[PDB]
């Protein structure tokens, strides 16, 4: 079966926490996090990827820069575009700018993406355990989420269907001794290391798709 807990940060698949600042680009941070773990799995090298590359160039795939977007449209762009640059070559400035995509600076590629059956937390558990970090959307429009600090986050006002924020599941686990209760998803956010728990949040797991975490999960195929 599947492991009782997984934490890809402990295996070198995850870069330090980033900060999207005042730009609606969480979708891009989620998409680069997932691509960063897959390229690492494939090559053994961890390289920070460019969210800016995505914000500036994927309008054709249906993204809207700092006005919003979707992780699947971003993997679609890296595939149609044939590549994606590093952060070091195409830095993040948090505003919509001129597409400056440079093929010679590409450090990642993907042939498309795989989707996790919507609403299926156990399908998600399976993808996290066998693939690596997974891009997911959640409902983060809540004061308790803005002010989150520690523990398992559970917010009654959360929706599993109306989502507004893209994040990355880097693993899952539980608190205590019974591996079957008090479970949580380990999630990397893009509001800087200062938000939450060093930039992460534990979201209640197997509690009816809390905050929509398994409503729209996907990962790139490299």
């Amino acid at each position: 079966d599947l492991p009782k807990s997984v934490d890809w940060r402990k295996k070198g698949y995850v870069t330090p926490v980033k900060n999207q600042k005042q730009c609606g680009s969480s979708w891009a941070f989620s998409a680069t996090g997932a691509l960063e773990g897959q390229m690492f799995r494939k090559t053994g090298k961890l390289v920070s990827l460019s969210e800016q590359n995505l914000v500036d160039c994927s309008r054709p795939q249906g993204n809207q820069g700092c006005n919003g977007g979707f992780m699947a449209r971003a993997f679609q762009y890296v595939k149609e575009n044939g590549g994606l640059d590093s952060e070091e070559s195409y830095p993040y400035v948090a505003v919509d700018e001129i597409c400056k995509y440079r093929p010679e600076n590409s450090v990642a590629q993907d042939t498309g993406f795989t989707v996790v059956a919507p609403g299926k937390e156990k399908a998600l558990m399976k993808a996290v355990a066998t693939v690596g970090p997974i891009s997911v959307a959640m409902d983060a429009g809540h004061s308790s989420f803005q002010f989150y600090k520690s523990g398992i986050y559970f917010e009654p006002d959360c929706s599993s269907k109306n989502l507004d924020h893209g994040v990355l599941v880097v693993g899952y686990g539980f608190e205590g001794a019974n591996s079957q209760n008090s479970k949580y998803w380990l999630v990397k956010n893009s509001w800087g290391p200062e938000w939450g728990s060093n930039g992460y949040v534990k979201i209640a797991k197997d509690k009816n798709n809390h905050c929509g975490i398994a409503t729209a999960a996907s990962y790139p195929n490299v």
Binding site: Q22, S26, A140, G141, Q146, D164, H165, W191
Partner: peptide, 4 residues
């Protein structure tokens, strides 16, 4: 979503 954006940080407050």
């Amino acid at each position: 979503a954006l940080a407050a």
